[PDB]
Amino acid sequence: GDLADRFAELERRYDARLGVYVPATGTTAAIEYRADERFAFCSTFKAPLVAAVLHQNPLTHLDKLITYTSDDIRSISPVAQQHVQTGMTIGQLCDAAIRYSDGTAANLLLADLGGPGGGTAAFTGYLRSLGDTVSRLDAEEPELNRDPPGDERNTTTPHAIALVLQQLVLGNALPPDKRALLTDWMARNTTGAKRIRAGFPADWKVIDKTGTGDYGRANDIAVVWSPTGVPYVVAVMSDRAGGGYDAEPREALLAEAATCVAGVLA
Ligand SMILES: O=C(O)C[C@@H]1CC[C@H](NC(=O)Cc2cccs2)B(O)O1
Ligand code: NA
Q1: Which residues does substrate bind?
Q2: Nearest ligand, measured from the Cα of 86
Q3: Is 1 exposed, middle or buried (0-12, 13-18, 19+ CB in 10 A)?
């Protein structure tokens, strides 16, 4: 259709590979572009990671204090690295993992799921439990960013991650109370002003989880509400693998992709 051609023009203009998935609703068709193609998760996994922790524990667990050392700061950790002396509660870790993409928080929450591979296996299994047979997490931060194009490790697809997020925020994967916490953390995200948010009019609400990696990898997964309160899930994934491991990620690609989506859903 014409929208596919426009996504293709966007890819050509940015010298990038773009993936888009907006699940169909009772009133709207799905928007799909390279939606069954694999893209690195990057920091986007930190949102479903928080859902896994929520899922597996009573809410009182959020008050559990976790201590760690400066040697645990092995990845970009804007919150955790300033709380080595105090520790952080599981809830604070969930907050940081989503709103600041905190990698140490992510690793600690992975550990909290238990089992081999520092909780990476358990994370993947959580996604399996939501019907996702595609996504896989194989390493902790930062080593999960190291995989070259073509390697299936630490990848998802726009389709798979969109349907995960759909079930988590809009569906019944979580009880409404836990769902509200996940939603609130994504709502107050600090990292996403220049991506999906930048492509929707100000009277639309946007909650989201960003990620950035090597090979120009830039993702955003969002739930948006129209001015009338109609929700949609918008997953946008990109890389610029053609330019090499140090290709510049382009936030503006995601904003423009989201603009194209907002045009269809207005
Ligand atoms: O939310 C965002 O968009 C940024 C977030 C930062 C932590 C994670 N990145 C890393 O830890 C290393 C990186 C490689 C290339 C860039 S940062 B994550 O994937 O992305
Ligand atoms: Na500190």
Answers
A1: 101, 210-212
A2: 2
A3: exposed
Task: From the candidates 141, 238, 251, 256, give the one annotated as an active-site residue.
Answer: 141
Length of the chain: 266
Residue ranges of the domains in the chain?
Answer: 2-265
Which of 262-265's residues contact partners 24+ apart within 8 Å by CB, and which partners?
Answer: 262/199, 262/200, 262/201, 262/204, 264/3, 264/22, 264/28, 264/31, 265/22, 265/28, 265/224, 265/226, 265/232
Q: Single out the residue of 255, 263, 236 nearest to residue 195, CA to CA.
A: 255
Beta carbon of 220 within 6 Å of any ligand 1 atom: no
- The two tokens of residue 97 are 């993992």
> What are the angstrom distances between the C-alpha of 185 and each of 119, 142, 169, 203, 219?
22, 22, 11, 20, 18
Q: What is the resolution of this structure in A?
A: 1.9
Q: Is 101 annotated as a binding residue?
A: yes
- Measured from the CB, is residue 77 less than 6 Å from ligand 1? no
Ligand 1 pocket, residue 214 CB under 6 Å: yes
Q: Are 215 and 244 in contact (CB under 8 A)?
A: yes
Q: What is the 8-class DSSP label of residue 141?
A: T
Active site residue 141: yes
CATH 3.40.710.10 corresponds to the domain 2-265: yes
212 assigned ligand-binding residue = yes
Q: What separation in Å is there between the alpha carbon of 181 and the centre of ligand 1?
A: 23
For 207, residues 6+ apart whose C-beta sits below 8 A from its C-beta are 169, 183, 186, 187, 189, 222, 223, 224
Contact present, 3 and 264 (Cβ < 8 Å): yes
210 is in an annotated binding site: yes
